Amino acid sequence: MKSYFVTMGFNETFLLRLLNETSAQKEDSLVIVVPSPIVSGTRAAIESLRAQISRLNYPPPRIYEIEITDFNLALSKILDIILTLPEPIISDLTMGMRMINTLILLGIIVSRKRFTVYVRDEGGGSRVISFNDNTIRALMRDYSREEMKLLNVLYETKGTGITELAKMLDKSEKTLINKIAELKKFGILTQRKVELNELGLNVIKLNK
Amino acid sequence: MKSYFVTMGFNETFLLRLLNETSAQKEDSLVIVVPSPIVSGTRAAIESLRAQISRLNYPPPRIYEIEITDFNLALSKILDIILTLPEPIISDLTMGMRMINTLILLGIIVSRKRFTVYVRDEGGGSRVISFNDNTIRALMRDYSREEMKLLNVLYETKGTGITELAKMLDKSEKTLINKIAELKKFGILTQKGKDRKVELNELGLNVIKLNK
RNA sequence: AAAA
């Protein structure tokens, strides 16, 4: 099971593409936040979506309409929704008002729940970026000086095997293997040569 | 001095509004990052922004272009720019590609720099909302056991006086008054009502949602 | 939907 958590603009096909591409199930949660009042273009898009859910075996969407007066009051309503959603939360920030998308994104990040976010080229095509809760945790984690010395050696060597890495770092092979396991769980390196990935390069840039 | 860090679409209007709202000075840094190659509509928006800036003692913009291949490669480009920026950073996420704005927002957050974000109604309305690095700090702060007790009692009472709070938490009035002064300044507490009850403010009500 |  899955949740979808989006805000609707005037174009339901962004969401239909998301539901189709991530194999939406009838039993998933589909929650759509809209501003108050719901304007004519948004109502048409939601009603068009509703006219497809039976044919496509999708859940009926649950619409939340929210007044936006300031950041914190609106974030409270978004957080209330988020904290009830089954995980993972699937989000696609390509659709709907930027104010609400900003709330959704900050909300899912500070909630610490599991999520995947997509952001695409609005005008279509192939450009797309994506990230998840593990991406954000890795970038926001506090790294010890010993961890940073490990990562910085990997940055300099562009990859080293465990045996040679242990000798270079003056670490037990047993204790280095445990740290490598702890760090790959954050998704910042790969492996019997250990190597940084792109996310690990960003970690190094933040802790320089 | 402060810095402005935005992207740009086909319209300079929202950025000019932000510069007015946030008291832009000619010595501020204005940095604009755009997708490569710079398309015609964006070039026209930048040229129109420059002409308007020259009237108004605003900071002249420095332009960066980036390729967007994937999240981490593009974030590295954004981080490189961010680390050149004097603090605090001001951004408005209502202009330009959503992909770039998402990277700007995530970049300034994980850079741990001081920043303020504005984002506005883009479809005809007038509402603008705002948050800053202290917003994120307050929501993700590791509150102590004693701090959590205080925050939860305030939530459960919907606000109460210092004297009552000190009894419920088994503390002296003096030490509680000092903690409450600290968290008012930090920005999560207020003393509403005519009876001087202490309560969570709008930000504190979000903090408590993430902390029991 | 680079101003839902």
Going from N- to C-terminal start, the domains of chain B cover 5-137, 138-210
As beta bridge partners, residue B116 has: B90, B132
Displacement of CA A123 from its chain's centroid (Å): 22
Q: How far is B167 from B173, CA to CA, in rounded Å?
A: 9
Give the minimum alpha-carbon distance from B170 to chain A in angstroms, rounded to a whole number.
30
Strand A62-66, strand A29-35: pairing: parallel
Q: How far is B111 from B84, CA to CA, in rounded Å?
A: 11
Out of B73, B202, B210, name the one closest to residue A111 (CB). B210
Long-range pairs for B184-192: beta carbons < 8 A, 24 or more residues apart: B186/B134, B186/B138, B187/B134, B187/B138, B188/B138, B188/B151, B189/B154, B192/B159
State which residue of chain A sits closest to B140, comparing Cα positions: A110
Give the minimum alpha-carbon distance from B97 to chain A in angstroms, rounded to a whole number.
7
For residue A88, whether the previous peptide bond is cis, meaning omega lies within 30 degrees of 0, is yes
Alpha-carbon dihedral of residues B8, B12, B18, B21, nearest 10 degrees? 170
B111 touches chain A (CB under 8 A): yes
Domain B5-137 adopts which CATH fold? Rossmann fold (3.40.50)
Q: How far is B123 from B126, CA to CA, in rounded Å?
A: 9
CA distances from A201 to A192, B79, B80 (A): 19, 11, 12
Helices then strands, counting H and E runs in chain A, come out as 10, 9
Q: How far is B89 from B82, CA to CA, in rounded Å?
A: 9
Out of A69, A112, A129, name the one closest to residue B70 (CB). A129
Size of interface A-B (CB pairs under 8 A): 114
Resolution (A): 2.0
As beta bridge partners, residue A92 has: A118
As beta bridge partners, residue B129 has: B119
CB contacts of A72 in chain B (<8 Å) are 131, 135, 202-203, 205-206
Overall size of chain A counted in residues: 208
The SS3 of residue B53 is helix
Locate A130 and state its tokens. 């994506």
Say whether domain A3-138 belongs to CATH 3.30.360.10.
Answer: no
Say whether domain A139-207 belongs to CATH 3.40.50.10440.
Answer: no
Which residues contact residue B195 at a Cβ distance below 8 angstroms, ignoring those fewer than 6 apart? B161
Which CATH architecture does the domain made up of B138-210 adopt? Orthogonal Bundle (1.10)
B181 touches chain A (CB under 8 A): no
Nearest to A206 by CA among A116, A119, A142, A133: A142
The secondary structure of residue B189, as a DSSP letter, is E
B108 touches chain A (CB under 8 A): no
